[PDB]
mmCIF file of C-alpha atoms and ligand atoms in Angstrom:
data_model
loop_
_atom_site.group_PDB
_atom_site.id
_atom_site.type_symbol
_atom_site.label_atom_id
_atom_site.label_comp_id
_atom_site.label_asym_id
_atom_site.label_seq_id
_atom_site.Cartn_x
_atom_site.Cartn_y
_atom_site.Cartn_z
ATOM 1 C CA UNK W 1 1.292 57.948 -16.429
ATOM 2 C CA UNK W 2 5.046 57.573 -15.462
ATOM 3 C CA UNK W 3 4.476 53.605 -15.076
ATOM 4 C CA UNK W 4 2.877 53.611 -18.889
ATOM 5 C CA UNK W 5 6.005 55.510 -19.946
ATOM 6 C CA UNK W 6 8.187 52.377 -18.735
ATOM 7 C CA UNK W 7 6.145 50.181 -19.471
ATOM 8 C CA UNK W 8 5.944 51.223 -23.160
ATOM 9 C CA UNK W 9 9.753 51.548 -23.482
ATOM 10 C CA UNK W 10 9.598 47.987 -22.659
ATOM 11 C CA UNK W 11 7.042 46.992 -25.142
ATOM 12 C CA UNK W 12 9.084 48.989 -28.043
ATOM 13 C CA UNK W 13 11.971 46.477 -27.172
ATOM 14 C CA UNK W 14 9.413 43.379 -27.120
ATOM 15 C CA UNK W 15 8.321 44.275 -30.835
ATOM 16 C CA UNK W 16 11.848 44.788 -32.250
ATOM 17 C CA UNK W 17 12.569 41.183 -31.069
ATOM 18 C CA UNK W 18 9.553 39.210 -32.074
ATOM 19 C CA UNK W 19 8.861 41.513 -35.359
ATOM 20 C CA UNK W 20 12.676 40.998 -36.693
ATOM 21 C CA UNK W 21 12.656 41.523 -40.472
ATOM 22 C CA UNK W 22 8.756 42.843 -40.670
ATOM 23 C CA UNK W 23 9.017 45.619 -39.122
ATOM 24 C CA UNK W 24 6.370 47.205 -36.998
ATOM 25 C CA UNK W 25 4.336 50.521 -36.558
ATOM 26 C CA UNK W 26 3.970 51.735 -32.576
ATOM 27 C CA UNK W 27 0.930 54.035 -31.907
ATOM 28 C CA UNK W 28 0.260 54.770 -28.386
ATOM 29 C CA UNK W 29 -2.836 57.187 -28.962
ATOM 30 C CA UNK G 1 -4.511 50.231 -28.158
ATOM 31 C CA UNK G 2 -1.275 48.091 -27.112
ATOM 32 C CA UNK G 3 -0.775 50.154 -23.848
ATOM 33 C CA UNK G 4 -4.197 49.258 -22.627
ATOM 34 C CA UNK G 5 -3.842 45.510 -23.477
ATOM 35 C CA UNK G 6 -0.267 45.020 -22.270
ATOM 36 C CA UNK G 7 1.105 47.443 -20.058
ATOM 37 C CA UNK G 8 -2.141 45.492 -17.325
ATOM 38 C CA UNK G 9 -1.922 42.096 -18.174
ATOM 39 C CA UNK G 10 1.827 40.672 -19.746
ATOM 40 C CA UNK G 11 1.678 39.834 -23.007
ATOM 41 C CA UNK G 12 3.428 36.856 -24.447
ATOM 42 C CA UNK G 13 5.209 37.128 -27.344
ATOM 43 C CA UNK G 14 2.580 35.423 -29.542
ATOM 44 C CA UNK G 15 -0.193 37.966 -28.930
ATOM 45 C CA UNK G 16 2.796 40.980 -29.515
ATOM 46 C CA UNK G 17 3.163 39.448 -33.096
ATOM 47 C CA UNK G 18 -0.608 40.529 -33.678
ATOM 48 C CA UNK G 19 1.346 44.214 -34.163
ATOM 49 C CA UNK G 20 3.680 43.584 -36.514
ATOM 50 C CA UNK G 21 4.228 44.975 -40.286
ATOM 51 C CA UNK V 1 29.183 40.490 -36.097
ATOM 52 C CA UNK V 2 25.284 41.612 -34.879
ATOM 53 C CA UNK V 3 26.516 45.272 -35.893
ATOM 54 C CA UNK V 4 22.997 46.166 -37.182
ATOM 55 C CA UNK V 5 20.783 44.502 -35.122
ATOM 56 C CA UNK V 6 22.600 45.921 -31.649
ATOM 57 C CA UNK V 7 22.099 49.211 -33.799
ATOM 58 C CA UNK V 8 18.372 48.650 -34.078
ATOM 59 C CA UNK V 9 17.522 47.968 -30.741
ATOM 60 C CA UNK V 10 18.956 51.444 -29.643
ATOM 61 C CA UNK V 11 16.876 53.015 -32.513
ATOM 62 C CA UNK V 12 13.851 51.848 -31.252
ATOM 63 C CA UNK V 13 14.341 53.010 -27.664
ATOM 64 C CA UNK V 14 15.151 56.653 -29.342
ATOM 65 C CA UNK V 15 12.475 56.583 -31.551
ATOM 66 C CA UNK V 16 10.242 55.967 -28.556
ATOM 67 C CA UNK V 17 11.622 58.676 -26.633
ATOM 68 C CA UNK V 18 11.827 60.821 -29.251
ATOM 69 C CA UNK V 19 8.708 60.792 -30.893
ATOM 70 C CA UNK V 20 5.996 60.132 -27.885
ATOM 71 C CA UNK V 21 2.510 60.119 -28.171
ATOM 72 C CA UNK V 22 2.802 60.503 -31.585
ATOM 73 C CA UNK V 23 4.640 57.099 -32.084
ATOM 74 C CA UNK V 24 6.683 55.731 -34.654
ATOM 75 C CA UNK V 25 7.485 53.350 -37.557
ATOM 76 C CA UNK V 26 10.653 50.985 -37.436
ATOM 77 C CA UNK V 27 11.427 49.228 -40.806
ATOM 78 C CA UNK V 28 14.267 47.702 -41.164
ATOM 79 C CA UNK V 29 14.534 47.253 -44.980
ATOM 80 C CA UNK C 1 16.167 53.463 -44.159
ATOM 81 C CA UNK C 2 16.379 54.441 -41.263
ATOM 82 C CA UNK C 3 19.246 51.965 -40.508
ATOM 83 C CA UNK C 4 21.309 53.086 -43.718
ATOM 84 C CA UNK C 5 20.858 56.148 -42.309
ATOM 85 C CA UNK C 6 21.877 56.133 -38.641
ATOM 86 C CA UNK C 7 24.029 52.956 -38.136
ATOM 87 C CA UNK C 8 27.532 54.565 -39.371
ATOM 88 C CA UNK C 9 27.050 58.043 -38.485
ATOM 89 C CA UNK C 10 25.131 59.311 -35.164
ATOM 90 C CA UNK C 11 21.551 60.545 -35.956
ATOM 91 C CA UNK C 12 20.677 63.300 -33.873
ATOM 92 C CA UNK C 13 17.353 63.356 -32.216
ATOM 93 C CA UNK C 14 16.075 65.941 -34.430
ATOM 94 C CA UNK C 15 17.343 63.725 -37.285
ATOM 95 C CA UNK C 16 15.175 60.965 -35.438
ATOM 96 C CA UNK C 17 12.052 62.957 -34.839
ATOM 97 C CA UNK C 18 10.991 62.274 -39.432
ATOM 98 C CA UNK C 19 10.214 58.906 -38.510
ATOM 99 C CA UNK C 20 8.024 59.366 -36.278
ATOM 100 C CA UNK C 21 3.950 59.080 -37.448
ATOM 101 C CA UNK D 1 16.179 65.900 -7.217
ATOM 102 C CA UNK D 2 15.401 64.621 -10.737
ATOM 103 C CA UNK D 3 13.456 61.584 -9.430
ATOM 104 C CA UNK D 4 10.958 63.979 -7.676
ATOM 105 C CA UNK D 5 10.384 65.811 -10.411
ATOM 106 C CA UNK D 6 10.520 63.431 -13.252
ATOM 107 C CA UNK D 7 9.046 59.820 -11.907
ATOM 108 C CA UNK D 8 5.919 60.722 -10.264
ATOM 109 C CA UNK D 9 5.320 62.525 -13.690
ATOM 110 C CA UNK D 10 6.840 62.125 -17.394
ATOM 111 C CA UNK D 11 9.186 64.926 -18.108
ATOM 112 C CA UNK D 12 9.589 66.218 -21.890
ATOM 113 C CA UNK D 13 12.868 66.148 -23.373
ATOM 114 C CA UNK D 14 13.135 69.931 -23.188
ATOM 115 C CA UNK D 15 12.920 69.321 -19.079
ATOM 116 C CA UNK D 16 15.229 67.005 -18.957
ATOM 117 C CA UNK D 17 17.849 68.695 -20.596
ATOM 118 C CA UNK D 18 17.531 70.871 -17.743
ATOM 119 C CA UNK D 19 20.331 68.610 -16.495
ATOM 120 C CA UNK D 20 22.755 68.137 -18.904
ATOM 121 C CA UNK D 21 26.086 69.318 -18.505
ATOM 122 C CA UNK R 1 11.646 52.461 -3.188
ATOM 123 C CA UNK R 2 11.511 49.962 -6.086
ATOM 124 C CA UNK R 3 9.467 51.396 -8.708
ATOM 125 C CA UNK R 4 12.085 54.648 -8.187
ATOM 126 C CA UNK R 5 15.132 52.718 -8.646
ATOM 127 C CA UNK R 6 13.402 51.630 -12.363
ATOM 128 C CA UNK R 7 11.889 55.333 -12.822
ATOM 129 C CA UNK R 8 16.212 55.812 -12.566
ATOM 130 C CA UNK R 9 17.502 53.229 -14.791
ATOM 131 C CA UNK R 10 15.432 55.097 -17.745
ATOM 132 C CA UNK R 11 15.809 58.352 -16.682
ATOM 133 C CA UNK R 12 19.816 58.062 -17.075
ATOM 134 C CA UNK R 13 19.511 56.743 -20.502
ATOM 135 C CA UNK R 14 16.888 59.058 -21.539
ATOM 136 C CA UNK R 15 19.531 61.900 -20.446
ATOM 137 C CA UNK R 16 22.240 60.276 -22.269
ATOM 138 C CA UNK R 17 20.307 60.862 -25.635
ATOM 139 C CA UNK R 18 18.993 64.326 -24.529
ATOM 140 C CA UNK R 19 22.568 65.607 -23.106
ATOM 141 C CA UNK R 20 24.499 63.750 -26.128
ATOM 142 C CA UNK R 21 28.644 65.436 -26.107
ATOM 143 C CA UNK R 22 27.745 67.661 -23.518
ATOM 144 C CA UNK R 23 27.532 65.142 -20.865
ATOM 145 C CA UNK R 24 24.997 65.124 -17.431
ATOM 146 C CA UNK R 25 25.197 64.675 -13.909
ATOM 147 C CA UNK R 26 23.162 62.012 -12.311
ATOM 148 C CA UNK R 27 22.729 62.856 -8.461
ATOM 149 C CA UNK R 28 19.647 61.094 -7.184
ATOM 150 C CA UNK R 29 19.927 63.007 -3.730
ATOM 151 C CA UNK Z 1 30.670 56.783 -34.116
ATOM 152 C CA UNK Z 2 28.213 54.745 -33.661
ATOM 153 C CA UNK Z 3 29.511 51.920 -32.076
ATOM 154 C CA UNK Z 4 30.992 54.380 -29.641
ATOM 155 C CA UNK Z 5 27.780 55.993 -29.030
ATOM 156 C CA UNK Z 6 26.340 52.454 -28.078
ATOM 157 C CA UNK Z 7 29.439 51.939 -25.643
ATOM 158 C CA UNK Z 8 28.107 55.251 -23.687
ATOM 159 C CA UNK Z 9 24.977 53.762 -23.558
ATOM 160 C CA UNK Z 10 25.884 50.498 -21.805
ATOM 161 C CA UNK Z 11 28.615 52.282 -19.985
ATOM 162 C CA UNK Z 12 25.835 54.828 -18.177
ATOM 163 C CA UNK Z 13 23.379 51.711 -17.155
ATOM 164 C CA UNK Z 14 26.364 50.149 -15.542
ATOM 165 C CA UNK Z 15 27.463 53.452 -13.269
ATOM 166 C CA UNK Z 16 23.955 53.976 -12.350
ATOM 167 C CA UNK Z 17 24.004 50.175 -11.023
ATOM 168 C CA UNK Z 18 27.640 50.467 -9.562
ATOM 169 C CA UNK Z 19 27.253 53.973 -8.064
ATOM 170 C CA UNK Z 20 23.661 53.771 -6.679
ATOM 171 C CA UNK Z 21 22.817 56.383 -4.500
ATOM 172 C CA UNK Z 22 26.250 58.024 -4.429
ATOM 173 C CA UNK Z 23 25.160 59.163 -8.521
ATOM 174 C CA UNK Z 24 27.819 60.371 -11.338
ATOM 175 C CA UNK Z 25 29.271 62.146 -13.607
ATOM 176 C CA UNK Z 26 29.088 61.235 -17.694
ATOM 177 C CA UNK Z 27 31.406 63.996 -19.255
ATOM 178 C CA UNK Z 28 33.125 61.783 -22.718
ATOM 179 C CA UNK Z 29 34.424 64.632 -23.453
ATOM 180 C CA UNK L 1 33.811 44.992 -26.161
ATOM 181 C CA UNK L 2 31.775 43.853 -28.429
ATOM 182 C CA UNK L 3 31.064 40.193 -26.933
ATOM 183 C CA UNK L 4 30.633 42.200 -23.617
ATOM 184 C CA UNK L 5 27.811 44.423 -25.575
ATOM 185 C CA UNK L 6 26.578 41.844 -27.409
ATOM 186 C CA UNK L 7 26.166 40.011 -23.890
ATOM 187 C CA UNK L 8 23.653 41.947 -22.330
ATOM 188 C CA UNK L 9 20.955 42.090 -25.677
ATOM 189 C CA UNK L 10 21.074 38.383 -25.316
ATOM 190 C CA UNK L 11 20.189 38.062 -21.803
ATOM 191 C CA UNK L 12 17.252 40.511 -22.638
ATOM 192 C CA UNK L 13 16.075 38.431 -25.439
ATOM 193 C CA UNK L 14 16.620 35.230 -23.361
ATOM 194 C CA UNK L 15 14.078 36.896 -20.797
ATOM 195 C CA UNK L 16 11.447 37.140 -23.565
ATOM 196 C CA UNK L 17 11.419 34.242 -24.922
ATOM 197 C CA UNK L 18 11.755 32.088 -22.027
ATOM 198 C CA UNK L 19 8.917 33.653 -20.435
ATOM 199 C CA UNK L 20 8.295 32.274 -17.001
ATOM 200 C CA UNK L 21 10.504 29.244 -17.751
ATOM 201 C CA UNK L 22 13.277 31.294 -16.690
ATOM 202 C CA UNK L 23 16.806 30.400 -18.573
ATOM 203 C CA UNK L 24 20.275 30.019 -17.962
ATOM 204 C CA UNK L 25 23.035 32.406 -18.957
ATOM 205 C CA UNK L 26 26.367 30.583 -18.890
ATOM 206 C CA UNK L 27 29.083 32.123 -21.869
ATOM 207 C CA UNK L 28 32.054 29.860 -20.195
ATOM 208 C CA UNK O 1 29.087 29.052 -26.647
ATOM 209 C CA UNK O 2 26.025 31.337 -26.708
ATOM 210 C CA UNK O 3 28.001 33.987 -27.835
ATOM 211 C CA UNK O 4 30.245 32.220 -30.512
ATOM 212 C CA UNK O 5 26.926 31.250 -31.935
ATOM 213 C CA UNK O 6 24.765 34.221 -31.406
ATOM 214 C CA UNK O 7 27.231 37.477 -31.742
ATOM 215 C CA UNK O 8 29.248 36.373 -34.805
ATOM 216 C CA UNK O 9 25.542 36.188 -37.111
ATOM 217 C CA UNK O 10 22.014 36.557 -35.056
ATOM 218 C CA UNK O 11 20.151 33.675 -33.309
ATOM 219 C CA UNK O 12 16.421 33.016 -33.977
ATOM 220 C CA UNK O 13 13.722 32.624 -31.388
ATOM 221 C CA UNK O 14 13.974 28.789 -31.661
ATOM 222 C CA UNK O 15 17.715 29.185 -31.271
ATOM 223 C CA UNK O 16 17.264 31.209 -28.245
ATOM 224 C CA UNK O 17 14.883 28.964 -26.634
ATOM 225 C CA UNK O 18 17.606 25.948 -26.518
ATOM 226 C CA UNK O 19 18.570 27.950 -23.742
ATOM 227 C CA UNK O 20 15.226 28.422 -21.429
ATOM 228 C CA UNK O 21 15.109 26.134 -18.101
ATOM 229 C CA UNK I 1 38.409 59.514 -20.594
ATOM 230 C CA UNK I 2 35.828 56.854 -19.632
ATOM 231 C CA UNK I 3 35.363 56.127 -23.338
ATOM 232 C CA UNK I 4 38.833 55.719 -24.172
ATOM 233 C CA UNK I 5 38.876 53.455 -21.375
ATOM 234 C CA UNK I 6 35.968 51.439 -21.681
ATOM 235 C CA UNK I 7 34.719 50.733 -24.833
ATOM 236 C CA UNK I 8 38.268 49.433 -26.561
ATOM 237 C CA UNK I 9 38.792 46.896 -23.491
ATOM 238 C CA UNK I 10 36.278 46.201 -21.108
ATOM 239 C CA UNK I 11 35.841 47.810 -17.191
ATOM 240 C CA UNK I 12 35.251 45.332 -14.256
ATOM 241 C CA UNK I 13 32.433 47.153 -12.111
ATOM 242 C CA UNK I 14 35.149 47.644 -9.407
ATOM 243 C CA UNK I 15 37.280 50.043 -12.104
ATOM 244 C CA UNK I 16 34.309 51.947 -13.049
ATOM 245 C CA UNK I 17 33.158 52.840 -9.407
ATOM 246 C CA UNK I 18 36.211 55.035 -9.889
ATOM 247 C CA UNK I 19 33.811 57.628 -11.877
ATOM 248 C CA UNK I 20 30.770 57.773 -8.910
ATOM 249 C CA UNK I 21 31.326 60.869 -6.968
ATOM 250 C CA UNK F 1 2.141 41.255 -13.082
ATOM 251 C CA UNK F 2 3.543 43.619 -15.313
ATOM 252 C CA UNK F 3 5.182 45.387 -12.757
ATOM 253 C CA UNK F 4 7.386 42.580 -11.646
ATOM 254 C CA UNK F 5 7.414 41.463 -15.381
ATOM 255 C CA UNK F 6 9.200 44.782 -15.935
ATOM 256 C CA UNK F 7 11.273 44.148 -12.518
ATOM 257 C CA UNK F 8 12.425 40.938 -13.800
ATOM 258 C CA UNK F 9 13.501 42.396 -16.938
ATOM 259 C CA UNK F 10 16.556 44.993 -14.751
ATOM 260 C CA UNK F 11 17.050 42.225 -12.689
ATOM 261 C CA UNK F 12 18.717 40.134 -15.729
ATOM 262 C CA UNK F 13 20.358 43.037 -16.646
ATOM 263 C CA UNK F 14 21.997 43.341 -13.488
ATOM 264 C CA UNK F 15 23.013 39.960 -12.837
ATOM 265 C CA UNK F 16 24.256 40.250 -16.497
ATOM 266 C CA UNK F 17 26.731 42.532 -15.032
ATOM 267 C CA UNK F 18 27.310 41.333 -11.687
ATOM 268 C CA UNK F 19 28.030 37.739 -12.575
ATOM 269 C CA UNK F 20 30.258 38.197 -15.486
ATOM 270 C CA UNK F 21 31.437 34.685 -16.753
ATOM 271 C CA UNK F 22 30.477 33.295 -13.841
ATOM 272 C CA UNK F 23 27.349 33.162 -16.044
ATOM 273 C CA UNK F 24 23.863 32.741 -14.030
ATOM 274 C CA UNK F 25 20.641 30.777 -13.738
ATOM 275 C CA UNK F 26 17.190 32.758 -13.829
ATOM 276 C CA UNK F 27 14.587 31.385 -12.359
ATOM 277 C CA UNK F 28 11.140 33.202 -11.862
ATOM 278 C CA UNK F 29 8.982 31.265 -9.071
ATOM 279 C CA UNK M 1 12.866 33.322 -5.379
ATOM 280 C CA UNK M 2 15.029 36.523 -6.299
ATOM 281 C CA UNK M 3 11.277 38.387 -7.858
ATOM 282 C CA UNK M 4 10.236 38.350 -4.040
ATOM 283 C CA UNK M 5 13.204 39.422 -2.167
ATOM 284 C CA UNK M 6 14.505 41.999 -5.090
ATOM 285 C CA UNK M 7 11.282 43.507 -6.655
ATOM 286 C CA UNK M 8 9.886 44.358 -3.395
ATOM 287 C CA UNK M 9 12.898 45.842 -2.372
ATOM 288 C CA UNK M 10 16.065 46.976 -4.034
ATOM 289 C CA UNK M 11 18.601 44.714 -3.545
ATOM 290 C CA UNK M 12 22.507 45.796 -3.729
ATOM 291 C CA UNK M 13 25.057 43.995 -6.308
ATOM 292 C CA UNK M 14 26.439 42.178 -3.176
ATOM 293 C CA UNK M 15 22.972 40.516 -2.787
ATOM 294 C CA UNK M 16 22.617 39.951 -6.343
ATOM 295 C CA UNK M 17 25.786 38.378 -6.472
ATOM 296 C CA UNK M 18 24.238 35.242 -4.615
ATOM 297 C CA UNK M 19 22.627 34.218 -7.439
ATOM 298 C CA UNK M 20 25.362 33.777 -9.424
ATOM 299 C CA UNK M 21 26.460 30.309 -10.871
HETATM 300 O O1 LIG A 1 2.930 43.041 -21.597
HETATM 301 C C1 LIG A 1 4.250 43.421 -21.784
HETATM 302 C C2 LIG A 1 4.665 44.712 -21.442
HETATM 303 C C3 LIG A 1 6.000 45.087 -21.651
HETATM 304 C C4 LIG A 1 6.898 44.184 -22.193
HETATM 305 C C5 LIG A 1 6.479 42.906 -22.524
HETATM 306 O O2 LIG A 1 7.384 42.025 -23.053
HETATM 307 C C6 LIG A 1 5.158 42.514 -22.319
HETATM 308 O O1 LIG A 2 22.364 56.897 -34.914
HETATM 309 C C1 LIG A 2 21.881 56.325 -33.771
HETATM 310 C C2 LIG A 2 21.904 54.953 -33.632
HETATM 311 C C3 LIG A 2 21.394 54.378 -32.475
HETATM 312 C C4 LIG A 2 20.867 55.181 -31.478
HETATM 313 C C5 LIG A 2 20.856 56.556 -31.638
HETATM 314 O O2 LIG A 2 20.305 57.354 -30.679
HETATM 315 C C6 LIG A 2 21.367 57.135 -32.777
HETATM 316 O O1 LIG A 3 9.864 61.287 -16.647
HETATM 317 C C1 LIG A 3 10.626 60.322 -17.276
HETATM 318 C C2 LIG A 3 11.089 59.213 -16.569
HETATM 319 C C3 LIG A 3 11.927 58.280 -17.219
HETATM 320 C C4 LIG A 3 12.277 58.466 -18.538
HETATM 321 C C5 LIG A 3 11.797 59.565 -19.224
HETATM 322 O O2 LIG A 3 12.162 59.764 -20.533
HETATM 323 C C6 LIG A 3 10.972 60.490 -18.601
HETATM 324 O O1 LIG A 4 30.847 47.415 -30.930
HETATM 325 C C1 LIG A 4 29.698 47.671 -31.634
HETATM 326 C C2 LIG A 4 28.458 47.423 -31.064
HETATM 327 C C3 LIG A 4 27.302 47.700 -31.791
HETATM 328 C C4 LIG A 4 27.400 48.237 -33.081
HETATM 329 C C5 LIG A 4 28.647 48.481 -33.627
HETATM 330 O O2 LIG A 4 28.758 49.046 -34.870
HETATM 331 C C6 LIG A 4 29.794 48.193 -32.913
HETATM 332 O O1 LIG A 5 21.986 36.906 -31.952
HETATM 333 C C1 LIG A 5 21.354 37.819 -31.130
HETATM 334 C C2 LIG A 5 22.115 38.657 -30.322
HETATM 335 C C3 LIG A 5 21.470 39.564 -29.465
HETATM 336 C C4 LIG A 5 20.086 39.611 -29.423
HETATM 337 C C5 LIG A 5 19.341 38.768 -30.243
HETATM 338 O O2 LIG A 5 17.984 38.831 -30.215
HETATM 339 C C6 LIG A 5 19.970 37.880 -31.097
HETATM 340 O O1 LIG A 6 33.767 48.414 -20.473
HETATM 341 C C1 LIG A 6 32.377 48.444 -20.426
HETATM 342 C C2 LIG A 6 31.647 49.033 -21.462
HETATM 343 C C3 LIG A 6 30.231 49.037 -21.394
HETATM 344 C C4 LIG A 6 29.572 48.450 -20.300
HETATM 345 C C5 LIG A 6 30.314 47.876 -19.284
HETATM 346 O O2 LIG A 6 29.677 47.306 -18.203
HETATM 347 C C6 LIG A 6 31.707 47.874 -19.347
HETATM 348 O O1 LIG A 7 31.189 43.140 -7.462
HETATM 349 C C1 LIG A 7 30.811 44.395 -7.042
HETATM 350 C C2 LIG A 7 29.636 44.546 -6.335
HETATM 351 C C3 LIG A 7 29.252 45.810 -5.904
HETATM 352 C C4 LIG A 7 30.048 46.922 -6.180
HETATM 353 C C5 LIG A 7 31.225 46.761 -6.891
HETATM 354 O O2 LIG A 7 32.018 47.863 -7.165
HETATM 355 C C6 LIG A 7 31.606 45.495 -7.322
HETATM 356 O O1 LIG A 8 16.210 45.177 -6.614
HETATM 357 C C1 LIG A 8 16.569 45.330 -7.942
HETATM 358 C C2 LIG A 8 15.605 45.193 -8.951
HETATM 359 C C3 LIG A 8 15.966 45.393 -10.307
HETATM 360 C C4 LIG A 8 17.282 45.725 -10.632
HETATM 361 C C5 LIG A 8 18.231 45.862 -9.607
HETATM 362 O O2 LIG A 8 19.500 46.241 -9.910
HETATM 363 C C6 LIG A 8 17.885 45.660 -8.265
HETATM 364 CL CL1 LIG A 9 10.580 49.625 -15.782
HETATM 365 CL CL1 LIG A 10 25.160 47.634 -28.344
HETATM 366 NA NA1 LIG A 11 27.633 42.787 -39.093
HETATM 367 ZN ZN1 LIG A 12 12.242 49.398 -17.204
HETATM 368 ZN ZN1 LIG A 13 23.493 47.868 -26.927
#
């Protein structure tokens, strides 16, 4: 659970970066 | 979803752009 | 100066924490 | 926007919380 | 401490500000 | 002891947004 | 301020790498 | 400050994109 | 530098890899 | 305070081991 | 790996901060 | 490499500092 967590705070950053203008919609569930 | 594909194996950021707007 | 986009990637971390399971949207127009 | 919104003045999380789905 | 209690499982936000000043 | 020292890195910035003007103590002991 | 508020952020990573097990304090007030 | 700020959101997009190429960091 | 040229406006991807090994 | 310090001119990490306790 | 993936990604960071201008070369395997 | 010796163990800023240019 805990290593998910991290591991999605790290994804978040991933799709900022490569979606630049775009945009992007995060959805976990 | 993106957790189960990504958070196992690393995802490059090619396949990431498959989840953007 | 990157003002906005250094201001972004901070967004996105909060959003993350903020919002959870539930996820988010990020659009940055 | 979000970023018209919150990139002057500090957006508390509560602020933060109506953009998420 | 904190890392007992909050990286074996997530803790809210509401348990975290259990240690804010 | 790895995986904590991460789990720590997050867990201070996560306070940071949670604690905002008041402030936090970070004592990992 | 935001670009203040982004300072704190950066500035709480780096004690938690600088201090290690010793911890902190984070009291900008 | 806002070089040194700047900085460190470069080095994190540098280790995205270079994958495992690695990079190098040098500012000087 | 890589700062003159990326913190004054914002390097692309293809910018940023100029600078992978 | 830390912030008056170290966000208008930048702290070497031996200056800022001055706020571990 | 993910996990060292994620690893990799504080590790920067830290050298980031560590080597200053001395600037740094980051090489995986 | 520095993945082997500092993400199976945590390595101090001293030991980081070897990798520096
Ligand atoms: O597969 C992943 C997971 C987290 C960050 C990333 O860039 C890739
Ligand atoms: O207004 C903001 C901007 C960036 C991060 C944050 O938590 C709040
Ligand atoms: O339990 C945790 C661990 C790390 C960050 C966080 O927001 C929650
Ligand atoms: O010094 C900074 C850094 C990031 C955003 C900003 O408005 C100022
Ligand atoms: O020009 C920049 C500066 C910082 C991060 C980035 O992705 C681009
Ligand atoms: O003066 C500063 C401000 C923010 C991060 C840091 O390492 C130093
Ligand atoms: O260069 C360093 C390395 C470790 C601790 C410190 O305060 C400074
Ligand atoms: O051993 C490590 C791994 C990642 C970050 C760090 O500061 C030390
Ligand atoms: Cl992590
Ligand atoms: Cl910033
Ligand atoms: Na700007
Ligand atoms: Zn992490
Ligand atoms: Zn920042």
């Amino acid at each position: 659970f805990v290593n998910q967590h991290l591991c999605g705070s790290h994804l978040v950053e991933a799709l900022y970066l490569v979606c630049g203008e775009r945009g992007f919609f995060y959805t976990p569930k | 979803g993106i957790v189960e594909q990504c958070c196992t194996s690393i995802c490059s950021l090619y396949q990431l752009e498959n989840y953007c707007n």
